[PDB]
Amino acid sequence: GTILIDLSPDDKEFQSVEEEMQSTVREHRDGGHAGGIFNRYNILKIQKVCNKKLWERYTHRRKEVSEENHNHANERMLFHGSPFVNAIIHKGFDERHAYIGGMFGAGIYFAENSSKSNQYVYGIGGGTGCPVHKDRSCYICHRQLLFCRVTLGKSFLQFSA
Amino acid sequence: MAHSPPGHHSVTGRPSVNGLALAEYVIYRGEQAYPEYLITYQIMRPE
Ligand SMILES: CCN(CC)c1ccc(-c2nc3ccccc3c(=O)[nH]2)cc1
Ligand SMILES: [Zn+2]
Known part of the structure; x- marks a missing residue:
């Protein structure tokens, strides 16, 4: 039951999402091995996911x-990159979308830096x-990321390298 | 998936070496995230 609604580049909502994407590149x-070498993106489309x-x-x-948690969801907007982005938007996040080998155990990982995702x-x-x-640094092929609403609640703080 | 640490709903990975990195987060229940925007893009070659 998912529909995707295109946002116009003239829409304030498109513009604020693009700004979060661009401004959180690091x-x-x-040295670019995993994600490629770049300082910014060419945004081709932003779609709202409706389900x-x-x-x-x-x-x-x-x-x-x-x-x-004293009436506090501790809700954030965070990036998620995955080979399964098209499954996620249709079926929702579940255990099949977890990074089993992640440094904080088997769970679903999100980033403040779009370039991390x-x-x-x-x-x-x-x-x-x-x-x-x-090519991990392909400048031609179209990539997709999710910008997600995430409930953190009470979060365990791990200081890490 | 693993469980959240007892008494918690998520984990925050705070960077302790790279001063420019932002935080990363982990949830252990898929119901704690909604994929609100799908962004299609290319990375741009610097210059
Ligand atoms: C479930 C598919 N999978 C194995 C290819 C997978 C692995 C890692 C990620 C992932 N890990 C992160 C780790 C730190 C910060 C952000 C992310 C992220 O966006 N995705 C997503 C999916
Ligand atoms: Zn390519």
């Missing part, structure tokens, strides 16, 4: 978390790069 310690059942699944859990578009470590050219 350099990576791998009533998946939204109600989200808000139901958000209310459970908020009630366990960009490293996972073609798999862990960028996999073998784009399917057409086998």
Whole structure:
């Protein structure tokens, strides 16, 4: 039951999402190995993901978390890159979308830096790069990221390298 | 998936070496995220 609604580049909502995408690019310690070498993106399209059942699944859990945390969901907007982005928008996030080998255990990972999530578009470590050219720094092929509403609740703070 | 640490709903990975990196986060229940925007893009070659 998912429909995708295109945002116009003239829409304030398009513009604020693009700004979050562009302004959270950083350099990576791998010199661009996983995600490619770039300082900015060419945004081709921004679509709103509309699914009533998946939204109600989200808000139901958000209310459970908020009630366990003095009425504070601690909701953030965060990036997610994955080979399974098209499955996620149709079926919702679940255990099949977890990074099993992540440094904080098997869970679903999100980033404040869009460029961090960009490293996972073609798999862990960028996999073998784009399917057409086998290039982790492909400047031709179209990539997709999700910008997601995420309930953190009470979050365990891990200081890490 | 693993479970959240007892008494918590997520984990925050705070960078402790790279002063320019922003935080990363992990949830252990898929119901705690909604994929609100799908962004299609290219990376741009610097110059
Ligand atoms: C479930 C598919 N999978 C294995 C290819 C996968 C792995 C990692 C990620 C992922 N990891 C991150 C780690 C830190 C910060 C952000 C992300 C992210 O956006 N995706 C997404 C999907
Ligand atoms: Zn390519």
